[PDB]
Write a protein that binds this ligand. Structure first.
Ligand SMILES: [N]C(=O)C1=[C][N+]([C]2O[C]([C]OP(=O)([O-])OP([O])(=O)O[C][C]3O[C](N4[C]=NC5=C4N=[C]N=C5[N])[C]([O])[C]3[O])[C]([O])[C]2O[B@@]2([O])C3=C([C]=[C][C]=[C]3)[C]=NN2C([N])=S)=[C][C]=[C]1
Ligand SMILES: [N]C(=O)C1=[C][N+]([C]2O[C]([C]OP(=O)([O-])OP([O])(=O)O[C][C]3O[C](N4[C]=NC5=C4N=[C]N=C5[N])[C]([O])[C]3[O])[C]([O])[C]2O[B@@]2([O])C3=C([C]=[C][C]=[C]3)[C]=NN2C([N])=S)=[C][C]=[C]1
Ligand SMILES: [N]C(=O)C1=[C][N+]([C]2O[C]([C]OP(=O)([O-])OP([O])(=O)O[C][C]3O[C](N4[C]=NC5=C4N=[C]N=C5[N])[C]([O])[C]3[O])[C]([O])[C]2O[B@@]2([O])C3=C([C]=[C][C]=[C]3)[C]=NN2C([N])=S)=[C][C]=[C]1
Ligand SMILES: [N]C(=O)C1=[C][N+]([C]2O[C]([C]OP(=O)([O-])OP([O])(=O)O[C][C]3O[C](N4[C]=NC5=C4N=[C]N=C5[N])[C]([O])[C]3[O])[C]([O])[C]2O[B@@]2([O])C3=C([C]=[C][C]=[C]3)[C]=NN2C([N])=S)=[C][C]=[C]1
Lengths: 239, 239, 239, 239
């Protein structure tokens, strides 16, 4: 399919429900050779099994909180893919207390720091560590959400981290474009209705197919873009 | 390819340089069966020849200035495609005096009326006339430009017509979504550099591949969206 | 007041409830000398009544559907004010059956034409006709609505006209800026209470106060801008 | 003046050139009683000098990197003002080598952390610490830049921090709105002349005038908004 010839690193697979699992399935279906990271010992086996099902045995530890963990992961990847064609960043975190109740009362310096570090800084952290490894025609992809652009109850400091992430997409697109690298985001709708134009929530298949496109040469003209894959939800009001 | 099974009507082919020609080529490459309209007697032969080269002999007259011309075209199409899966609207016009010099001095009531009528109203005019003919899963596509969002010298009243067109995308997406129809726009970069992140202007191949995606089931999650296919130009400043 | 020494023409006063009324009130409070237009003879007396209360006896007929009516209004105005400091455009119209039900079904070529002509073209028609009369430091103001940016049920074709209007703000600002004229819009909330950050609907006073600022030299740094005066409604979601 | 009866805290006065200075001046002109903070002992005298000229002897140390410093500042302030009417946040910082050259190369985890903590988290840190002190009708104001929305060379990680900041405006506006507090930002132009619609760079006076409006009850209808005070620069392209 339209990704044949392409080697893509997929982060953030934690289950069959993971957006990153929808994405990996779509990309494998389209001929991509895939590699996988897992955060910790808890997730290793699950990811190894998913990776084997998608014809891959590149399954590498990466905790994006640590610069050393990222560098080590890309050194391991280089033994088998001295060059590759980009990555899917489907990662973020905020401490649980951050994401419930009044935003101003919930947010703390430490919660803000972690949300921004894991959910925004890590995208460019990965880009920096693998920069010389990317072929011309490479594409990077991250996942965002409408809370970056609107104040959504409870989403709280993650809205700010996502806004930071979307700016990071633009700054990265601008920096790496001259070396033949594109950088985009998908702003996905919430994954499981009456107010969405298409009258349903998007599925990880929808998200996956858009992701496959944005990482393929089919999207050669698209960079620094946040594409809304939310069924039109964000463009409607008072439906 | 990813458009097999799909019947798409393509408007706006006037030459090999036409965006709509890039789009038709991409879609044919991906397995779509195509139909074509031509504005007038001058363009008929060129379009017939392009259509034959892309395995089609559905070549129908349509001048979107006239409600009768549109209805007649869709009656002719119905004899051969009683149902189809959407259309590509790659059409607009403003009188030549509109598009040069100071916007306020150039614009006239009549120029504004024509620019908006041909370049914005015609998208929904076509949708209205073929509404009952569209299958569930249908996609409509139009072409826009950054002048809808920024004031660009000389682009003048067409900027306003394009802003109207982009709103029309949202309103149409919202109206037709419940019947299984998606509606998007591509905001293409100018087609033939130092300031664009990807360091080149997009080509009708870039535009065509994005268009093929947006009219395919691969983009099932995307509606009422204006996707920038301009190489990142609009997201950079002072480059 | 912060409008002392300013002469501002105000269109669209139709009653004591009109947004244009709240605007005229706030401007008069702030030291502006005002002039008023009215659409037809049906409203001549009533508008003379309002102008009276606001220190004005400059009351002129103007139907923005006609170039000759606009021209003759500014000629009359020129007899009292050979120079003045800008105007407020608070005018718009679509035929009634445009504004009910499914957009794609309701919209017609003629309904589209009128909505755009009266609600968008008229803004620049007015600027063209008084361009040579404007002092340096002049400001033009129009009134938009969130329907320009989002698909709102029943707002239908007015959404497109308002999008054309906001583009018109940008193109006008760009063209007239160099001779010292600013051009802006206010996107007002409806005159919703439950989901607005400020937990109330805005008033003609809130709107009038922002209008007065945007036509004064206090807003000297602001041009080409759509200022949302809707209590934050448009930046919130799922409240 | 239109700020009579208001008590507003102003951060970020570092010299007579500071945007915060132009803001304090405009507010004092309009009848506001002011208080000032300063970052370190290096600036204590100089800021007392400015406060003096602006009818104020409320001058308090505050380093926004520390929760205890913010807490102790608002405790001191509480002795003169048990209640007040909001504050201006005109504070931000990235280590210097963050702001030069290719973004992906310059950015580090620590540089990112600091930029976001000082330029974005501090805004909400301040709101949290004085939340119970704010009168109904209070307004908070921060200062952003177009780098939040576009990739600007060398602005680098500050672009992400400002995007986080503008999201913070929205989330703060949403959370504090119901108790009668508004929150907005001004995105100021640089303090370019050739491509700005108004053909000049904006001044600390233009900025100060818009700031004064946005902290006054005149802007009662405006919350959650980023107001561009850049002479229209961001709405123009290819000028
Ligand atoms: N879901 C939905 O709806 C959505 C989502 N979004 C986004 O995307 C992404 C992804 O997610 P998901 O797939 O869903 O989830 P999960 O599966 O859980 O995943 C995550 C991941 O990450 C990782 N990590 C963490 N931390 C870390 C990591 N790695 C490495 N290192 C470190 N340190 C784990 O492991 C996993 O795998 C995301 O980003 C999202 O976002 B959010 O915010 C959201 C959600 C939901 C909704 C909305 C939003 C969730 N979550 N999140 C986060 N996490 S941040 C988008 C849209 C939609
Ligand atoms: N090019 C570029 O760069 C671009 C473009 N854009 C858009 O898209 C569209 C399409 O275009 P093109 O392809 O390029 O061109 P042509 O070829 O010429 O085509 C057109 C068409 O249309 C038609 N018509 C007209 N009128 C009519 C018709 N049909 C029917 N009926 C009627 N009445 C003809 O025939 C032809 O075929 C468009 O839309 C565009 O836009 B614009 O504005 C632009 C340009 C350039 C640049 C920019 C923009 C051109 N043109 N235009 C118009 N026309 S409106 C987008 C982006 C880019
Ligand atoms: N309301 C609300 O909420 C709003 C509104 N907006 C806008 O603003 C403007 C103004 O309106 P109002 O004030 O509201 O109302 P009125 O009083 O009725 O006014 C109107 C005016 O106009 C004029 N005209 C007409 N036609 C014509 C004229 N002139 C001349 N010529 C001609 N042809 C009359 O007379 C009067 O005075 C407007 O623009 C508005 O918009 B809309 O769309 C809307 C509404 C509602 C809501 C939303 C929107 C209503 N209406 N509209 C129209 N009409 S266009 C804004 C915001 C809000
Ligand atoms: N300039 C211009 O053009 C602009 C600006 N913007 C903004 O605003 C603000 C303020 O700034 P300015 O006034 O300009 O400056 P200054 O005077 O130097 O100020 C600063 C301040 O802060 C403070 N701090 C620091 N650190 C700290 C503090 N406090 C406390 N704690 C701590 N740790 C000091 O002391 C002073 O006072 C800002 O925010 C700005 O932003 B940015 O970014 C920018 C610039 C330029 C341009 C653009 C942007 C500069 N800078 N920056 C910073 N820093 S962040 C806006 C617009 C415009």
């Amino acid at each position: 399919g339209f990704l044949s010839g392409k080697r893509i690193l997929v982060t953030g697979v934690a289950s069959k429900l993971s957006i990153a699992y929808g994405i990996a399935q779509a990309m494998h279906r389209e001929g991509a050779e895939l590699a996988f990271t897992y955060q910790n010992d808890k997730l290793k086996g699950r990811v190894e099994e998913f990776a084997a099902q998608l014809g891959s045995d590149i399954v590498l530890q990466c905790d994006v909180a640590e610069d050393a963990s990222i560098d080590t992961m890309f050194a391991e990847l280089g033994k088998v893919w001295p060059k590759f064609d980009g990555f899917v960043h489907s990662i973020g975190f905020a401490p649980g207390d951050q994401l419930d109740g009044d935003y101003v009362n919930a947010v703390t310096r430490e919660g803000f720091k972690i949300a921004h570090d894991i959910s925004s800084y890590s995208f460019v952290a990965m880009a920096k560590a693998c920069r010389s490894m990317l072929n011309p025609g490479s594409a990077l992809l991250t996942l965002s959400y409408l809370g970056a652009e609107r104040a959504i109850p409870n989403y709280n400091v993650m809205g700010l981290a996502k806004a930071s992430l979307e700016a990071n997409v633009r700054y990265m697109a601008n920096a790496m474009g001259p070396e033949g690298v594109r950088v985009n985001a998908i702003s996905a709708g919430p994954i499981r209705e009456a107010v969405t134009p298409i009258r349903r929530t998007v599925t990880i298949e929808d998200v996956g197919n858009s992701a496959a496109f944005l990482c393929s040469d089919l999207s050669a003209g698209i960079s620094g873009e946040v594409v809304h894959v939310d069924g039109g939800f964000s463009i409607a009001a008072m439906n």
